[PDB]
Amino acid sequence: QVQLQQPGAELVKPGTSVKLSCKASGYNFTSYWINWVKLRPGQGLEWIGDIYPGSGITNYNEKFKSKATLTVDTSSSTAYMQLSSLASEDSALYYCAGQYGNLWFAYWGQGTLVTVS
């Protein structure tokens, strides 16, 4: 049923940029918020921001304001996150999670491990 699909890994070069994808499946993409979190092992889980696909409004952790840009493609039901000026500190696991049933992190993707060389 409801499910989020992200590519499993991304090999990036420092200084460049990357756009992570999150494709929503069995539900009204337009009706729920999409969350993006970062997981550096041993360095905790971090909320990056939200985006409501039906309006485009976003909420950012002011800690990731100048780093991540959340966008969506209403046509393909895909949520996007672009990371700029990739640095080694950006190497982490990135999940997108959707809200559902009145809960903000109800469904999770399997994550995209980003390794910047």
Binding site: W47, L103, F105, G111
Partner: protein, 107 residues
């Protein structure tokens, strides 16, 4: 930001063992505490929400309690499938913040 701290980063135990994971907030979060589990295959699931409400399809051996800034998760009988990493999250105020996680292992 409200800092969440899971004191123990790694915990060892034997299957059948009764285990407890604690999580502390830097300030009262009025029971808006959620627990997530990340299985070895990379999947993440919502286990408990609002401190003690077990989520859909979660085994009864999982339980939560807490108030103020003190919260913990408890697994009555440690099962093989329970071997994973648990994270606590506060949903009291934005930005949402999570604890560092607790890795569960055998022995």
């Amino acid at each position: 930001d409200i800092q969440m701290t899971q004191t123990t980063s790694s915990l060892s135990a034997s299957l059948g063992d009764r285990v407890t994971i604690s999580c502390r907030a830097s300030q009262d979060i009025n029971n808006y505490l959620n627990w997530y589990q990340q299985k070895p295959d990379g999947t993440v699931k919502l286990l408990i929400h609002y401190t003690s409400r077990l989520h859909s399809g979660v085994p009864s051996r999982f339980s939560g309690s807490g108030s103020g800034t003190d919260y913990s998760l408890t697994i009555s009988n440690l099962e093989q499938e329970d071997i994973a990493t648990y994270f606590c999250q506060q949903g009291n105020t934005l930005p949402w913040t999570f604890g560092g996680g607790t890795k569960l292992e055998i022995k």
